[PDB]
Amino acid sequence: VKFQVGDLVWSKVGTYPWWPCMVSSDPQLEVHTKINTRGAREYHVQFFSNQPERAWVHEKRVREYKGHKQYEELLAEATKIRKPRPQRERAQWDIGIAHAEKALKMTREERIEQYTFIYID
Ligand SMILES: Cc1cc(CN)cc(C)c1-c1ncn(C)c1-c1ccncc1
């Protein structure tokens, strides 16, 4: 366990670029971390965006969020070619980054109060 509830992280999921997230407790399992069916550690995260979403993400696809300018360093981990990004996706990402930048200025306790999602059955 490297991350706790309220920690700001970048998550790399599916076809999406490294995305600003907050580690949170799964609403049903009541854990923020688990070992998956393949025996690997996963973290439960909230995606910062105008579209609220959550996911279990493999620990290898999670990085500590130190700031928005870290994005270049993440692309450099893959090792000049640059992938373009769609305008709609870039816009949601900019909203996510804006929230992440405000969250980074808060303590872990303030982030949890401000951003933890409300789940409705
Ligand atoms: C986890 C997840 C679930 C659902 C619902 N089926 C839809 C999407 C797009 C996603 C997602 N996966 C990866 N990212 C980055 C996101 C996401 C979430 C919020 N805003 C923008 C991108």
**Strand ranges, E, within the chain:** 8-11, 19-23, 33-35, 41-47, 53-58, 62-64
Q: 82 alpha carbon to ligand 1 midpoint, in Å?
A: 22
The helix/strand/coil state of 85 is: coil
Kindly state the tokens that stand for 31: 């854990």
Q: How was this structure determined?
A: X-ray
Q: Which domain holds residue 67?
A: 1-121
Calculate how far, in angstroms, residue 99's C-alpha sits from the geometric centre of ligand 1.
16
| CA 102/CA 19 separation, integer angstroms | 15
The number of domains in the chain is 1
From 9, 12, 16, the mutation candidate for ligand 1 (largest count of ligand atoms within 8 A of CB) is 16
CA-to-CA distance for 51 and 119, rounded, in angstroms?
14
Find the 118 Cα to ligand 1 centroid distance in Å.
17
> Does residue 76 come out as left (phi exceeding 0), alpha (psi in the -120 to 50 range) or beta?
alpha
Spatial neighbors of 90 by CB under 8 A, at least 6 apart, are none
